[PDB]
Structure 1
C-alpha cells in the first residue's frame, strides 16, 4: 500500500523479481539469497548509527546492535576457523582497500593476478585506487596449461621483490595451492593476502581448500558462492594485524557500518554453518562440471584449462560466433544470462573478448541438478550454433520457460 504512493519504483521491483524468475542466471558471481537474508536487511536496524566496534561505540543505545555484530563476527570466526573477523566492510572492494591500508604504504610494490586471467579491479587495475596508490606488477597463468605455475611466480617474485602478494581470482576454475602462495611470500619476505570472494562458499562447504591458515589476511564478499547479502568481510589469525585492520575499516576508510546488512551477514553465516550448506557446495561443483563437460565434448568449443574444480569455467566461443559479446547477446535472447569474459592471453578487445564465463551457484540455489545443468549447456551450444535462426531461438526460449517454471526462484 506504500506501493500505491510510488508505482514507478514498485512496478520496477516487481518486474526484477519476475525477470529473475523467468531467466537462467549463469553469471558466476550471482546467487539467490534466502528470504531470511533479505528480511534481515529490511529491518529497523538501518535506524541505528554504530560508528566504532562492539563495546567501543561512538554513541549509546548500541547494546543490541553489539549482540547482532558480535553474532556476525563469532559466526565468521567459527565458519572460517579464523581468530579475528571484521564484518563492517561495505563491499569486497572496501575490504581490500582496508587490508592494503593495514599492511603496506602508497608506492609499495604488490603482485596480483593479471586482470585477463581473473585478477579483480582492486588487484592493481590502473582505473582502480589499487593501481593508482600502489605499484602493482601482475603474474599470469602458464600460456600452454592455463594453470598457475608456482615455480614461475616464485622466479618473478624474487625479481620484483613485492611487499605484498595478492592471490584469488574471478575467472580461475582450478584448485589454488595456498600453501605454495605462502611459501612464495615467505621466500621473498612479502605479506600474502587472499581475496576468496568467488570461492568463499566452497571454502565454507569444504569443497575448496581454505586460504585462512596460509594468508596473513583473507578478504571476501559475503555475496557470491557464500550466498550472503552484498558486503565484505576480513579474517586474520594475527592480533596485531587485526588491530590495524579494525582501525583501517573505521575510522580509516568508512564511517558508520550498515548494521541491517551485518544482521543479514549473521543470517547467511549461520546458513553456511548448517550441514545442508555442504550439500549445496557439492551440487555447485557437480552442476558446474556437468555444464563444462557439454562444452569439452563439443568439437567447436574449448573450456579454459580443460575444465573446472569449482563453481565456474570459461569457454572460447570464437569458432562459433565472432566474440563473447555476441555470445552474451545471443544467450540473452533465450533468457540465459552470463557474461562475456577475457580468456588468458586474450587477443580481442576487452569490450568483445574470446570467452563466456559460466557459473552454477544461482541454478544450484534454485534446486537444479546435473540433468538440468547438462540441458542448459546443450541449449547454450544449440543457440550459439543456430544464432541466425529465430525459430530455433524461439523454441529454446520456450523450453527455458518450462524449466524456470519447474524450479521457482523463491
Structure 2
C-alpha cells in the first residue's frame, strides 16, 4: 500500500526531513550572523523564494510560448511571456529592437548557449583574461596552457588583458590582438573588474576585425537595470547575464539579442535585419537544454518586476556608494586596490604588497564569519594574490556607507591578525595553520562580527520565525 498523499506529499519539511530542515535553519543563521562580501552573492526576496519553491517545478514546457512540445502550458506560457516582457522593460529595451530568452538554467549555461548559437566548434573567441578580471566562461585556459573552461575546449580562446600599470583594460592591445587573431566573437564584461567598460571602443574593435560583440553583464546587471553604469545594449549584439547577483533574483540566466533592421554598414546589403533570435532559441533548446525550470522563470519574473522599481534604483545607487566608501577606507589604511578604486559593486584588493596570499586572508576571514573569496589578480598563474569584496549582499540588508566603513575596519582587523599569525608561525601553510587554533583574537573578532551582523534586517525569511536565534 502506498503512503496517503497527505503523509508523503503534504507534510512539511520540518517533519519529513528534520536533518535537511535543521541544516537549512543553520545556514539561515549563518547568513544572518556574518559579513557576507562575496561580490557574486545577494539575499533575494521572500516573494522570489515563494515562486521558486512552487508547483511550477512540476511542468514540462519545452519550446517557446505558443509553440511547445507538450500539452498543458496555458499558464506556463503566460508566465514565460511576462518574464520576457519584464526583462526587456527592466533594461529599457524596445521590443522591436531586442528580444530575450529566459530559459538558461544559470549563467554558464547562458553563455555556452549564446556561443553555440553564433559559433561553430573551434571558432575563435576573445574575452577578458581570468587574472585580469574575466570569467571562466570567457575562454579561460591557464598561463601554463591548461584548458579549464569548456569555452576553451569547444572553441578557440585568446584572452585580452589589463594594462599592468593602471589595471584597466588596455584597449590598444585588445585591438592589436583582435586584428592578429581575428576572433569571430569578442566578449566584454567580467567577474572581478572594478571599472566600467568602454563599449563604444569594443564596438570599434569588433567592427575593425569583423567580430560579433557580446557583453556578459552578470555581475553588474542590477546596476545596468538601474542605469547606474554604462549600458552594453547601446553597442553589443548579444548581452548575457545571470539573475542572482546584483539583480537580486533567483539563480538563472538570460540571453538578450538584437532584432529588426541592422544599422548601416559598408558592404552589408540594404534593409538587412538581425538574425539572432532563432539561432539563440535553438541553441538553448533543443540544442543544449531540455525542459525549462519554470519555478526559476516565475521567480525571475518576480525579481524583474522588483528591479524596475524606484526602491531598486536607490538600492543600486547605494551598492555603488557602499563599495566606494569601503574602498576609500581600505586605501586610507594603505592597502592596494586594483585600479585604485571602483566604479561598480566590488573592489579587488591586491594582497601581495603585504606578503599575503588570498587563501590566508580568506581562510582567516571565514573563521571570523567574514565571507570573501580569494581572487586572482594580474600576474597570478593558479592561493592567488588578491581578495575580492562586494557590496550587494550587505547593502540588501540595509547597510549604508558608515556601516561599510565598519566592514572596512573589520577587514583591517582581519588582515592585521593574518599578518601577526604569519609573522609568528610562518608563511608556509603547515606552519600558518597552527596560528588558527585557539586564537583568542580570532574568537574576539568572530564575536564582534557576529554582534555587528545579527542586528541588521534580513530579506527572504522572517528572523522571528527561524529555529536558531542565538
Provide TM-score, normalisation by structure 2.
Answer: 0.84
* Structure 1 unmatched ranges of 5 or more: none
Which residues of 2 match residues 129-278 of structure 1 at below 5 A?
A: 129-238=150-259, 239-278=274-313
Which residues of 2 match residues 103-142 of structure 1 at below 5 A?
A: 103-125=118-140, 126-142=147-163
Q: Which residue of 2 aligns with 1:402?
A: 451
Asked if structure 2 preserves the Cα contact closer than 8 Å seen for 1:383 and 1:392, the reply is: no
**3-state SS of paired residue (1:12):** helix
The one-character-per-residue Cα deviations of 1:161-190 (angstroms, maximum 9, x if unpaired) are: 111101111000011111111111011110
Q: Which residue of 2 aligns with 1:25?
A: 36
The one-character-per-residue Cα deviations of 1:123-145 (angstroms, maximum 9, x if unpaired) are: 11222221111110010000111
Asked if structure 2 preserves the Cα contact closer than 8 Å seen for 1:173 and 1:308, the reply is: yes
Question: Following the alignment from structure 2 to structure 1, what is the Cα–Cα distance between the partners of residues 239 and 356?
Answer: 38
Tell me the CA shift for residue 319 of structure 1: 4.0
**3-state SS of paired residue (1:116):** helix
The one-character-per-residue Cα deviations of 1:341-378 (angstroms, maximum 9, x if unpaired) are: 111122xx52x011100000000000000011001111
* Structure 2 unmatched ranges of 5 or more: 1-11, 141-146, 260-273, 422-438, 460-470
Question: Following the alignment from structure 2 to structure 1, what is the Cα–Cα distance between the partners of residues 244 and 417?
Answer: 35
Q: Which residue of 2 aligns with 1:72?
A: 83
Q: Which residue of 2 aligns with 1:15?
A: 26
**3-state SS of paired residue (1:138):** coil
Question: Following the alignment from structure 1 to structure 2, what is the Cα–Cα distance between the partners of residues 196 and 220?
Answer: 5
Question: Following the alignment from structure 1 to structure 2, what is the Cα–Cα distance between the partners of residues 327 and 249?
Answer: 40
Could you tell which deviates more after superposition, 123-132 or 163-172?
Answer: 123-132
Larger radius of gyration between Structure 1 and Structure 2: 2
Q: Does 1:97 align with 2:112?
A: yes
Question: Following the alignment from structure 1 to structure 2, what is the Cα–Cα distance between the partners of residues 81 and 405?
Answer: 37
Question: Following the alignment from structure 2 to structure 1, what is the Cα–Cα distance between the partners of residues 113 and 417?
Answer: 48
Q: Which residue of 1 aligns with 2:431?
A: none
The one-character-per-residue Cα deviations of 1:81-126 (angstroms, maximum 9, x if unpaired) are: 3420100000111111111111111111111110111221111122
Question: Following the alignment from structure 2 to structure 1, what is the Cα–Cα distance between the partners of residues 375 and 56?
Answer: 38
Count of equivalent residues: 406
Quickly say closer, same or farther: Cα 1:323–1:2, change in 2 above 3 A: closer
Provide TM-score, normalisation by structure 1.
Answer: 0.96
- Aligned with 1:312 (options 328, 346, 357): 346
Q: Does 1:384 align with 2:395?
A: no
Asked if structure 2 preserves the Cα contact closer than 8 Å seen for 1:321 and 1:384, the reply is: no
Q: CA RMSD in A?
A: 1.3
The one-character-per-residue Cα deviations of 1:287-312 (angstroms, maximum 9, x if unpaired) are: 1111111221122x200110100001
